[PDB]
Every structure is written in C-alpha cells, then in structure tokens.
Design a binder for this molecule. Structure first.
Ligand SMILES: Nc1ncnc2c1ncn2[C@@H]1O[C@H](COP(=O)(O)OP(=O)(O)NP(=O)(O)O)[C@@H](O)[C@H]1O
Ligand SMILES: C[C@@](O)(CCOP(=O)(O)O)CC(=O)O
Ligand SMILES: [Mg+2]
Length: 329
C-alpha cells in the first residue's frame, strides 16, 4: 500500500470577490490532514470514513466527488499511456467532529487527495500548476460554483496569493476538447507564495455552526458589485504587502478593511458568534475576521504580541469558541 495526505485551507482575505476571474485571494494552508491508502486489488473498492459503507465504481451520490475524480484521472493516465486498473482506496481523517465539518475545505482536499493517490500508485508526478488543473477539472466538469482557491492552497500547502481564472471558460474547453489539449493551455491563474516577515500567532476559532459553501455563494453572489471587487483586490494586495514588509499596524488595518467589505456585502456572512469572535480583538495588537463563506465555520486571527494572544484566547474561551488550530507564523 501507498499512503498520501492533503492539508486543509482557510481564506485570510479575498472571499467572494475571488469568484470573479482575475481577482485575488490570500489563502492559508492548515496542517490538519485528510489521508488515503491505495493499492492495486482484484476489484474496485472505495471507502471514506465520512460514510458507513464502501462502493465500487458504479455511481453513488455520497461518493460522486471521489468517483468523478477517479474518472478524470482515468483519462489523465490514458494520456500518459497508462490504463486504470482495480484498486482499493481508503480515505480517512474526515475534517469534522461530532458530525459537523470544521470548514477547512474538505471538498477540495479530497479531490487533491484522490489525484495524489492515483499519481503515487502509478508512479507519476505533476508540478503544482498541473495538480491544480487536474483537481480543478473535476470541479469544473460537475459545474461547481467555487473559485478553486481551496485547491490552489491545498495543492501548494503554503500561504498563497491566488489569482482566479475564468471557470466558465475552462469548463467550456473541457466539454468541447480533449483533456491533454486543455491541460497544456495557459489557464490564466496564478498561485504564488507569500512569506510574512514578522513574528505573529495565527489562531483559528471554530464556531461549531456548519455553513454550506455552495449555499452561501448561491445566495450572496448576486450582491457582488464592482465597488466591492475593486476594493477587495486592493485590500488583498495591501495585506500581502503589509505581511511581506512586516508591518503589524498595516496588517491590522487591511484585515479590518477586508472584514468591513464582507460585512457590507451580506449580513449573512457574520453570524453573532463570528462577530463576537472578531470583536474580541478590537483593543489588542491583534486582528480577526470571518474566514471563507462565513455563515458559520471558522474565524481567523493574527496576533502580534504575547499579551494580545493570551487575552484573545481567554476571550474566545469564554465566548464558546473552540480554538481549532494555532501556529507561530
Ligand atoms: N471526507 C470526505 N469524503 C468523501 N466526500 C467528501 C469528504 N469531504 C467532503 N466531501 C464531499 O464534499 C462535500 C462538501 O464539502 P464539505 O467538507 O462538506 O464543505 P466544503 O464544501 O469544503 N465547504 P468548506 O469546508 O467550508 O470549505 C461533501 O458533502 C461531500 O460531497
Ligand atoms: C466564499 C468563497 O470565496 C470562499 C469560501 O471559503 P470556504 O470554502 O467557506 O472556506 C467561495 C470560493 O471562493 O470558492
Ligand atoms: Mg466555510
């Protein structure tokens, strides 16, 4: 057996705006892993601990995302002169607790995970951009309403500055042209590392209220206007520059602008608990905001001194917020 793993992700800035082609988002990798075990066998067997039953390749709704990923990979392997053969695949480490997902991008992680598993099983490797394209193709083919930012971050497993591409356009290419031709074209996206140059604690507060990404996007996308898109893009650029220049005060400023833009976009993004999560940092050398589609899941914080981190943690503790993850940037 060969084992592989994929991380999770959490947006720092650029949410919603990133849905429009050419926009920017700053996305952070989270080392909480989805894991897989794969080996050739005499029949196809696929099991994910998110469910209480296994399936083979015959279509099943619970497993459709995984099966569609395998199907796309069957085509990729063909391009590379390889034929799909029966294998047993086990997926575990579901990014949920007590039946509730954390909000770490499990959908995107499992697609990258399965692509990684089949590549490893077939002794093949692909670079970062190709991995992103292969995993993105799966979501594009099923008409996903996401920006693919989660795939960009998980593929890179780093804090990345992601520039979105036109998903409707690439999906059209995939429906009309052979996969190799589509993969070889420049899609027009960008994924690059952002390395902060100052010390700081990164905290993740889980509100334990599940928020469905596709539902949030479906209802809030109509609220997106140009003023928001322009402001968001500038804010992501300024935040990246602040992190790279190591200026705490400018980071606090831009994260606050990002948060206010989200609040203005929709009253559904900030739930009372997500709002309390960011309010807990208002008088500290730290800053916080909702992360992702909002409507539940997690909030993130960046703290610039020991005292601020201690107080922020105590406040979140008293607020019923679970400290899901913490890291010294
Ligand atoms: N571990 C898994 N095993 C099998 N399928 C999964 C798994 N994780 C996610 N999926 C599929 O992805 C769907 C939605 O992803 P989910 O993890 O629920 O939230 P999400 O779409 O990632 N939103 P967010 O987690 O906030 O980025 C699930 O309903 C399944 O279809
Ligand atoms: C709202 C959105 O911009 C980010 C969603 O973030 P998350 O999947 O809730 O962590 C949607 C997307 O970009 O796919
Ligand atoms: Mg979410």
């Amino acid at each position: 057996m060969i084992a592989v793993k994929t991380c999770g992700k959490l947006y720092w800035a650029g949410e919603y705006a990133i849905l429009e082609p050419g926009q920017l988002a700053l996305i952070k990798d989270i080392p909480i892993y989805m894991r897989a075990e794969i080996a050739f066998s005499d029949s196809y067997r696929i099991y994910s601990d998110m469910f209480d039953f296994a399936v083979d390749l015959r279509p099943n709704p619970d497993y459709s995302l995984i099966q569609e990923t395998i199907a796309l990979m069957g085509d990729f392997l063909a391009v590379r002169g390889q034929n799909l053969r029966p294998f047993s695949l086990a997926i575990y480490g579901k990014m949920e607790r007590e039946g509730k997902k954390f909000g770490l991008g499990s959908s995107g992680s499992v697609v990258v995970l399965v692509v990684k598993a089949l590549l490893a099983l077939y002794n093949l490797s692909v670079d970062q951009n190709l991995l992103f394209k292969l995993t993105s193709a799966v979501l594009l083919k099923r008409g996903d309403n996401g920006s693919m930012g989660d795939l960009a971050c998980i593929a890179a497993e780093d804090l990345v500055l992601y520039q979105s591409f036109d998903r409707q356009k690439v999906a059209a290419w995939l429906e009309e042209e052979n996969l190799a031709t589509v993969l070889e074209r420049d899609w027009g996206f960008s994924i690059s590392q952002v390395k902060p140059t100052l010390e700081c604690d990164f905290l993740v507060g889980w509100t334990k209220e599940v928020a469905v990404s596709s539902h949030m996007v479906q209802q809030i996308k109509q609220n997106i206007n140009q003023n928001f898109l322009t402001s968001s893009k500038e804010t992501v650029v300024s935040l990246v520059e602040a992190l790279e220049q190591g200026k705490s005060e400018k980071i606090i400023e831009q994260v606050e602008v990002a948060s206010k833009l989200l609040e203005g976009l929709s009253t559904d993004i900030y739930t009372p608990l997500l709002r309390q999560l960011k309010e807990a940092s208002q008088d500290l050398q730290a800053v916080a905001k909702s992360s992702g589609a909002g409507g539940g899941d997690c909030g993130i914080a960046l703290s610039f001194d020991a005292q601020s981190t201690k107080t922020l943690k105590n406040r979140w503790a008293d607020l019923g917020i679970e400290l899901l993850y913490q890291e010294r940037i």
